[PDB]
């Protein structure tokens, strides 16, 4: 049996509402709930960012408030999925996407799952010339908000991470 | 890298909306997307039931229209969690709970994960005299729609399942 370990239900709107300059820049996400294996967040915006991120396992989408939208690989060509305010989406193991969030007090649910020990997260950067694979980083993910900042900055920093190794275009870094 | 294998997005209102006449009895909830490891349902009302669930894993609820409420057991004693149009609620594994929907029209996002091989999921009734547990069945999980039926319906029709160990009174049944 036992206890209630992450609190009594509560209202989420109102909860988003509170949040809110949280979900702004440079927050932007915000975890519900804290050490649970559903790894629970709202993410608002405006964010746009140049990774695409491989996840071991699936994520589940629910665009609450305002559009967004995930620049993906599916089938060798990108794509685009958009997340129109009401939609909901659930994306399979390791399909590369990249979230644009251009709204002001958007706001998505956004549900995962803890990875097990060895299972890994890649976060990779592609080439806008020739779109060969530029840097890839993996990563053994403890925290879906907080993992990810200085490893944008590292391939940020570096010329040579932004190298394409295909055509020698450097990449732009932090915006497209 | 892949394919998008659980389709693309969609409008998750529209969609209650076209299945309402499954969110009612005797269906009452509805699988969104088939053999993904997120098991991801909604629940519609009316339905009372007089089972508690123990789930090895978490349960995520999001209750979108109308209310509903969970009998919890925590820490030893019968509490009542209220699912109120708007509340979000993360449940910790084998806390045991006994959803009541009994609003029509209502609609309850409900995400659990598929459970591994060996992971089982328990049904209890306990006596509402005493509070003893009365009968326990275990289970390994396919289906969150339709495993459950054979099992409710073997507890009803047999009075041995339904004594009480503890004080011989004999539980009710189908309804409380
Ligand atoms: N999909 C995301 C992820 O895995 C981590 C952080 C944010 C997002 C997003 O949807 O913006
Ligand atoms: N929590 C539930 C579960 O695990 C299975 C089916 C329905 C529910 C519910 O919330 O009603
Ligand atoms: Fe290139
Ligand atoms: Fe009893
Ligand atoms: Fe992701
Ligand atoms: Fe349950
Ligand atoms: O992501
Ligand atoms: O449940």
Redesign the pocket.
């Known amino acids: 049996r036992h206890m209630l370990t992450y609190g009594a239900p509560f209202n989420f709107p109102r909860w988003i509402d509170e949040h809110a300059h949280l979900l702004k820049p440079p927050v932007g996400?915000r975890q519900v709930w804290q050490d649970s294996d559903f790894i629970v967040?709202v993410?608002g915006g405006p964010?746009h960012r140049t990774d695409y991120?491989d996840?071991p396992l699936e994520?589940f989408?629910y665009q609450l408030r305002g559009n967004?939208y995930?620049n993906l690989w599916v089938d060798g060509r990108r794509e685009r999925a958009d997340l129109k305010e009401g939609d909901i989406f659930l994306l399979p193991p390791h399909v590369r996407?990249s979230?644009q969030?251009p709204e002001a007090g958007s706001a998505?649910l956004?549900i995962?799952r803890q990875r097990p020990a060895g299972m890994l997260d890649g976060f990779e950067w592609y080439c806008d010339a020739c779109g060969h694979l530029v840097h890839r980083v993996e990563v053994q993910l403890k925290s879906?908000?907080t993992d990810?900042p200085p490893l944008f900055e590292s391939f940020y920093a570096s010329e040579d991470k932004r190298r394409c190794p295909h055509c020698g275009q450097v990449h732009p870094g932090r915006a497209a």
């Open positions: 996400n967040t993410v964010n991120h996840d994520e989408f967004a995930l996407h979230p969030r998505c956004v995962e879906i908000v990810l």
